[PDB]
Design an enzyme around this catalytic site. Structure first.
Site, PDB file in Angstrom:
ATOM      1  N   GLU A  35    -102.450  66.025  28.204  1.00 46.93           N
ATOM      2  CA  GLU A  35    -102.127  65.737  29.600  1.00 46.93           C
ATOM      3  C   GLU A  35    -102.753  66.755  30.553  1.00 46.93           C
ATOM      4  OE1 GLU A  35    -100.848  63.161  30.983  1.00 46.93           O
ATOM      5  OE2 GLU A  35     -99.909  62.065  29.333  1.00 46.93           O
ATOM      6  N   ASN A  46    -103.262  59.301  41.166  1.00 48.99           N
ATOM      7  CA  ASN A  46    -103.315  57.960  40.592  1.00 48.99           C
ATOM      8  C   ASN A  46    -103.723  56.940  41.649  1.00 48.99           C
ATOM      9  OD1 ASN A  46    -100.325  59.069  39.161  1.00 48.99           O
ATOM     10  ND2 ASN A  46    -102.201  58.818  37.964  1.00 48.99           N
ATOM     11  N   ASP A  48    -102.299  54.235  42.731  1.00 49.61           N
ATOM     12  CA  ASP A  48    -101.270  53.791  43.665  1.00 49.61           C
ATOM     13  C   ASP A  48    -100.917  54.841  44.716  1.00 49.61           C
ATOM     14  OD1 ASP A  48     -99.657  55.659  42.302  1.00 49.61           O
ATOM     15  OD2 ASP A  48     -98.573  54.147  41.171  1.00 49.61           O
ATOM     16  N   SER A  50     -99.698  57.860  44.039  1.00 48.36           N
ATOM     17  CA  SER A  50     -98.868  58.897  43.450  1.00 48.36           C
ATOM     18  C   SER A  50     -99.751  59.982  42.841  1.00 48.36           C
ATOM     19  CB  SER A  50     -97.936  58.311  42.390  1.00 48.36           C
ATOM     20  OG  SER A  50     -98.673  57.694  41.349  1.00 48.36           O
ATOM     21  N   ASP A  52     -99.748  63.101  39.604  1.00 47.63           N
ATOM     22  CA  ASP A  52     -99.149  63.697  38.411  1.00 47.63           C
ATOM     23  C   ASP A  52     -99.263  65.221  38.474  1.00 47.63           C
ATOM     24  OD1 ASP A  52     -98.809  61.063  37.521  1.00 47.63           O
ATOM     25  OD2 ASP A  52    -100.488  61.161  36.118  1.00 47.63           O
ATOM     26  N   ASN A  59     -94.975  62.293  37.183  1.00 45.66           N
ATOM     27  CA  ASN A  59     -95.487  61.446  38.254  1.00 45.66           C
ATOM     28  C   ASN A  59     -94.558  61.423  39.464  1.00 45.66           C
ATOM     29  OD1 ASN A  59     -95.550  58.251  39.311  1.00 45.66           O
ATOM     30  ND2 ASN A  59     -97.532  59.247  39.101  1.00 45.66           N
ATOM     31  N   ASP A 101     -84.967  58.061  29.061  1.00 43.50           N
ATOM     32  CA  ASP A 101     -84.726  56.918  29.933  1.00 43.50           C
ATOM     33  C   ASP A 101     -84.942  55.571  29.245  1.00 43.50           C
ATOM     34  OD1 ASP A 101     -87.470  56.312  29.874  1.00 43.50           O
ATOM     35  OD2 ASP A 101     -87.797  56.695  32.008  1.00 43.50           O
TER      36      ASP A 101
END
Ligand code: CL
Ligand code: CL
Ligand code: NA
Length: 129
Positions: A35, A46, A48, A50, A52, A59, A101
């Site tokens: 990562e 990213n 959209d 957003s 990271d 994110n 989650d």
């Protein structure tokens, strides 16, 4: 801060990540390697809008607030800049919420594509834990 491999393994172990939700330490080190290349200051935008953040590339659309991802949530209740600290505590505590989650470590695309199903114990081999 750019961690060494064994240095990061030891820091993650101390923060409770070894076997957390059934994921052995090697999985977490492998994910961090691909990562962020072990760099706490890594950021990536990213498509959209957003971003990271940090050693585990958490994110901004769901997990932290960076003030520029409209309509995002802040489920870890932290500013995204806290995820860039040389102290990995904030990243690890948020990661524990993500992996819990429902989707496990599949939340991390690099883990899914480059760590899952491999010999992840190799990532902690030779380290004094
Ligand atoms: Cl392991
Ligand atoms: Cl799982
Ligand atoms: Na957010």
């Amino acid at each position: 801060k750019v961690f060494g491999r064994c240095e990061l393994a030891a820091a993650m172990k101390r923060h409770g990540l070894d076997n957390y939700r059934g994921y052995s330490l090697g999985n977490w080190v492998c994910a961090a390697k691909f990562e962020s290349n072990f760099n706490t200051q890594a950021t990536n935008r990213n498509t959209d809008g957003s971003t990271d953040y940090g050693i585990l590339q958490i994110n901004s659309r769901w997990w932290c607030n960076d003030g520029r991802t409209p309509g995002s949530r802040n489920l870890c209740n932290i500013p995204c800049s806290a995820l860039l600290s040389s102290d990995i505590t904030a990243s690890v505590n948020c990661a524990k919420k993500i992996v819990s989650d429902g989707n496990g470590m599949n939340a991390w695309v690099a883990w899914r594509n480059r760590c899952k199903g491999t010999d992840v114990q190799a990532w902690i081999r030779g380290c004094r834990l």
